Design an enzyme around this catalytic site. Structure first.
Site, short mmCIF file in Angstrom:
data_model
loop_
_atom_site.label_atom_id
_atom_site.label_comp_id
_atom_site.label_asym_id
_atom_site.label_seq_id
_atom_site.Cartn_x
_atom_site.Cartn_y
_atom_site.Cartn_z
N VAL A 12 -0.90 -11.88 -32.30
CA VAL A 12 -1.41 -11.45 -33.58
C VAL A 12 -0.26 -11.53 -34.57
O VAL A 12 0.89 -11.25 -34.23
CB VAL A 12 -1.98 -10.03 -33.50
N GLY A 13 -0.56 -12.00 -35.77
CA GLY A 13 0.43 -12.19 -36.81
C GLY A 13 -0.17 -12.90 -38.01
O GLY A 13 -1.30 -13.37 -37.94
N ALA A 14 0.63 -13.01 -39.07
CA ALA A 14 0.23 -13.56 -40.37
C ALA A 14 -1.11 -14.28 -40.43
O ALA A 14 -1.97 -13.95 -41.25
CB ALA A 14 1.34 -14.43 -40.94
N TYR A 15 -1.29 -15.24 -39.54
CA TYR A 15 -2.52 -16.01 -39.46
C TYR A 15 -3.54 -15.32 -38.56
O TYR A 15 -4.40 -15.97 -37.95
CB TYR A 15 -2.23 -17.43 -38.97
N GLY A 16 -3.44 -14.00 -38.50
CA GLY A 16 -4.36 -13.17 -37.74
C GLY A 16 -4.16 -13.27 -36.24
O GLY A 16 -3.07 -13.63 -35.77
N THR A 17 -5.20 -12.93 -35.49
CA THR A 17 -5.19 -13.03 -34.04
C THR A 17 -5.26 -14.49 -33.59
O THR A 17 -6.11 -15.25 -34.07
CB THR A 17 -6.34 -12.21 -33.43
N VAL A 18 -4.36 -14.89 -32.69
CA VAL A 18 -4.37 -16.23 -32.12
C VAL A 18 -4.78 -16.22 -30.65
O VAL A 18 -3.95 -16.42 -29.77
CB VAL A 18 -3.03 -16.98 -32.35
N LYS A 54 -7.43 -20.29 -33.36
CA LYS A 54 -7.00 -19.45 -34.48
C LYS A 54 -8.21 -19.19 -35.38
O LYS A 54 -9.34 -19.49 -35.00
CB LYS A 54 -5.89 -20.17 -35.26
N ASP A 85 6.03 -20.77 -42.62
CA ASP A 85 6.56 -20.03 -41.48
C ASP A 85 7.16 -20.93 -40.41
O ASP A 85 6.67 -20.98 -39.28
CB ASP A 85 5.47 -19.15 -40.87
#
Lengths: 246, 291
Positions: free
Chosen positions: B13-19, B34, B136
């Site tokens: 989970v991070g900037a681009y949401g849950t991966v 993604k 990023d």
């Protein structure tokens, strides 16, 4: 150079967007070539009437063929598909994309924006958002860059080729032949017909088939076959251009 | 959901949401599902979303080694003012962090670096060639499944995700951002080169070379090593756009990095110039004496 590297990639991508030459037999039940003839020519008038970027029409037809290749469609719902393909084609190629409302206006509001937008996801998803596809125009320019002709001349070739490409797009040929062929056949028919009227001028015509098939890496008989097919399509405009009365 | 894909683990989970991570049933492969939210205009799919995604698909037909593939895309949820678009992806097994963390090496090697970097620049030079620029650029957004590979990731996405700051989040791991990326907001291609040297150093052999927090804090953190540039190498204009406050000088590279070679210092310097113009090229680097 980067000519070949891009061109190689263009051709790869060309094949990842290819429709099925069999879709009328295998996928479609209601829809027939004559109906696609009517939608394609309807789309062409819209692009002309709306002075769209010329690559919009042949791009939409690609979308339409690749979709009919994947989805069966009720004829009543064909025009709607045409519209959507132009909707997305325009969004992809135009600084001022076509309006959904303006598109429905062209159906005499037979269809509606809400429907259009439902289709857009249909279309876009079926195509797996693989939409920056190639057009004949992408190749025409390439071939044109490789050719020793004065900018004045390239302008006339460019004009005529894009006529032919439109002729092709309203024909089933466009389903069988990738834009590379369509572009080359059109350039070949254009430059050749220009060499006739003005001998000793468009002398890029000279064995241009082999030349362009050398580029495309294709059987030059297909380019010859394609060229003739086009030359015939053109003649078949002798009929249309006049019979508008009865 | 939903998609003709069956998820499993949740690699991040991070900037681009849950991966999350799934398999391709009728292919039998791994896929990195993604996702993103975009607004459902009156004119349908955001013109900029269709165009951005479309381009990422105009890549899988280059089959470039050191870049990940957008394998598929799907607009799942339509609703008045929002459509959700799952970006199906190629799936590496592990990343550059999980790579430098499961690190047997005490400090080294260098030919597991010199190649690995000369590689990293490759995918970057490609993505650049096609007019893509990464935000990023990180050890999160760099990866290898096995056998060594270096497939760059989460490229471009920044444009597609502009609708993220309607959540105004999240991590903001601003360890790598260029001296411009939040001194202004230039989003140039060179700023993508800066983030390179920051990974270039971090490889020898530790943690972030400039991790901090504050834009200016990192900006000053940066000046500590490179040395505060005098004018006219000094831009504008907004967002607490500080002028030169703390005055400093040029500090040796190999100093705080143990320890760059003859050139490894000099190259990372070319890389990490302040002035993006007299900076370094993604390619010209990719063929330096350091090789």
């Amino acid at each position: 150079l980067l000519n070949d590297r891009v061109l190689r990639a263009m051709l790869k991508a060309e094949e990842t967007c290819a429709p099925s030459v069999s879709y009328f037999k295998c996928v479609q039940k209601e829809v027939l070539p004559s109906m696609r003839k009517i939608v394609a020519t309807w789309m062409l008038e819209v692009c002309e009437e709306q002075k769209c970027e010329e690559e919009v029409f042949p791009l939409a037809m690609n979308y339409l063929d690749r979709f009919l290749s994947l989805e069966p469609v009720k004829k009543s719902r064909l025009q709607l598909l045409g519209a959507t393909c132009m909707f997305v084609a325009s969004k992809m190629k135009e600084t001022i994309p076509l309006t959904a409302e303006k598109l429905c206006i062209y159906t005499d509001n037979s269809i509606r924006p809400e429907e259009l937008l439902q289709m857009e996801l249909l279309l876009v998803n079926k195509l797996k958002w693989n939409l920056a596809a190639m057009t004949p125009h992408d190749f025409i320019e390439h071939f044109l860059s490789k050719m020793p002709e004065a900018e004045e001349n390239k302008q006339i070739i460019r004009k005529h080729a894009q006529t032919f490409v439109a002729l092709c797009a309203t024909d089933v040929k466009f389903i069988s032949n990738p834009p590379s062929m369509v572009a080359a056949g059109s350039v070949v028919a254009a430059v050749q017909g220009l060499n006739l009227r003005s001998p000793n001028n468009f002398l890029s015509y000279y064995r241009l088939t082999r030349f362009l098939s050398r580029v495309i890496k294709c059987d030059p008989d297909c380019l010859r076959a394609c060229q003739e097919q086009i030359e015939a399509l053109l003649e078949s405009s002798l009929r249309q251009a006049q019979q508008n009365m009865d | 959901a939903t998609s003709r894909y069956e998820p499993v683990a949740e690699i991040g989970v991070g900037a681009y949401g849950t991966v999350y991570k799934a398999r391709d049933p009728h292919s039998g492969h791994f896929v990195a599902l993604k996702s993103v939210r975009v607004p459902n205009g009156e004119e349908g799919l955001p013109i900029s979303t269709v165009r951005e995604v479309a381009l990422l698909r105009r890549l899988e037909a280059f089959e470039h080694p050191n870049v990940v593939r957008l394998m598929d895309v799907c607009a799942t949820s339509r609703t008045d003012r929002e459509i959700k678009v799952t970006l199906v992806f190629e799936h590496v097994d592990q990343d550059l962090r999980t790579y430098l963390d499961k690190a047997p090496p005490p400090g080294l090697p260098a030919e597991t670096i010199k190649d690995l970097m000369r590689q990293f620049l490759r995918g970057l030079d490609f993505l650049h060639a096609n007019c893509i620029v990464h935000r990023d650029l990180k050890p999160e957004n760099i990866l290898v499944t096995s056998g060594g590979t270096v497939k760059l990731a989460d490229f471009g996405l920044a444009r597609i995700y502009s609708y993220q700051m309607a959540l105004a989040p999240v991590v903001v791991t601003l360890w790598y951002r260029a001296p411009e990326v939040l001194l202004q907001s230039t989003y140039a291609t060179p700023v993508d080169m800066w983030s390179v040297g920051c990974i270039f150093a971090e490889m020898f052999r530790r943690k972030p070379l400039f991790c901090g927090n504050s834009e200016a804090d990192q900006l000053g953190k940066i000046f500590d090593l490179i040395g505060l540039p005098p004018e006219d190498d000094w831009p504008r204009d907004v967002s607490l756009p500080r002028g030169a406050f703390p005055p400093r000088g040029p500090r040796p590279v190999q100093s705080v990095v143990p320890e760059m070679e003859e050139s490894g210092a000099q190259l990372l310097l070319e890389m990490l110039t302040f002035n993006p113009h007299k900076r370094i090229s993604a390619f010209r680097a990719l063929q330096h004496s350091y090789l």
